[PDB]
């Protein structure tokens, strides 16, 4: 396998560079507070903001506070509150002490039912800086980017961390997607490091790839082969559509159903993606997707043309369905270590240990026809979901989450992002497995800590 190649490497020094040039902000800290009782829960929280309030207190370190905190047993009833400094801890407990609700404060009574669905997705979640800070400040995420940088440019002859280290570098639909996978794949090594696991996967489009690895369905390098396949031939196909061969891509808010009756309209439109109950994913000639947007402007829903030449998810695609399958032969199917709503396979359910999906006829059908998100999404509800956890540069796809868990009668569900644009991307991290403890699910909250050097890594916080 090919090494970092010397351009990273150069990125790599000018970005810590205009790194280490920066005004050092405070880190993002994770105070957890527990008992078997929310009644003790509260209290704790109220004398542990009690002795912060005080000279021994307010002399100790943040950090320290936190690091003897992840150490008490962790009990049913659970609390996190997040802070940068002092002020905010005590305001924050104050909340966790009164059961009032505020933004950097989350706690639950008791851990939730059941494990997380991982929401894989990536359309529309791009951007110029996309998992280049939390390259430069977390290890674990950079080796797990190192790697699929190394097998992307094993397969497609490019480096994906050149382009994530090079601020004047953009995205195209190819490098989107190897970009956005790369980046999916090292947020959920990042989130197994710190002992969290998924307990159901569920794909969207671009990634359905990752989807397959953190599922267990196939190997990093197989997985890689099969967003590489996919993601060339189509942006190297759409780069080649003029004229009579253009077909745009448009989100228009009407249901499935809604749709069977537009379309009589337009006889070329195809469903590409089922996002939520009446947000759907249209495509086909551009006067007719033209045409479908000005009749939902004509009836005040919403409606968004999306930047590309042509329609993946139709039957535009039949002309790169060869090639993907040549590409992709060898590629080895395995047997599911956790589940997977399809959305392939029209938002089905597969069990852990269940028999293979992830061969070359499954990426042939996946790019071919709809994605079926909002049935995934619902059938997880309906057989008792509740934490949705989003792997991405950009929660959009919890977006769609929402709509679909609202509309299943399912009216508090633990929506959970990741990475997002103008956020800082340690603190949001730092965020995110604080959520996966507050509501109980695997998360070694140890983890978040380093090993303590000496005494002062530690703080007198009330028994
Ligand atoms: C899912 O997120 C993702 C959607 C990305 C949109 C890319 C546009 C599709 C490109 C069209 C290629 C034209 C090929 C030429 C045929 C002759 C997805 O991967 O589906």
Redesign the pocket.
Known sequence: LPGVTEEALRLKEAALEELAAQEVTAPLVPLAVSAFLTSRKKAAAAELADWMQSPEGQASSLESIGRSLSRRNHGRSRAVVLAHDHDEAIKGLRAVAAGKQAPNVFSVDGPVTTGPVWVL???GAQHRKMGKSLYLRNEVFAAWIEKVDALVQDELGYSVLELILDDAQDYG?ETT?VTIFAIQIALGELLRHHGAKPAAVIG????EAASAYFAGGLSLRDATRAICS?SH???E??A??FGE?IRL?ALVEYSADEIREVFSDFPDLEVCVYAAPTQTVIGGPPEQVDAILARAEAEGKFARK?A??????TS??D??LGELTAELQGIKPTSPTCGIFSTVHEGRYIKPGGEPIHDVEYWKKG?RHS?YFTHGIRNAVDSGHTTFLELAPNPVALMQVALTTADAGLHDAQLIPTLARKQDEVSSMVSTMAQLYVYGHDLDIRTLFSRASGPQDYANIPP
């Open positions: 997705a990536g359309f639909i997607q969207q489009s671009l990634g996919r031939l189509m942006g196909g759409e080649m559509l061969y891509m999306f590309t030449k042509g329609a993946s998810h535009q695609m002309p790169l790019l994605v």
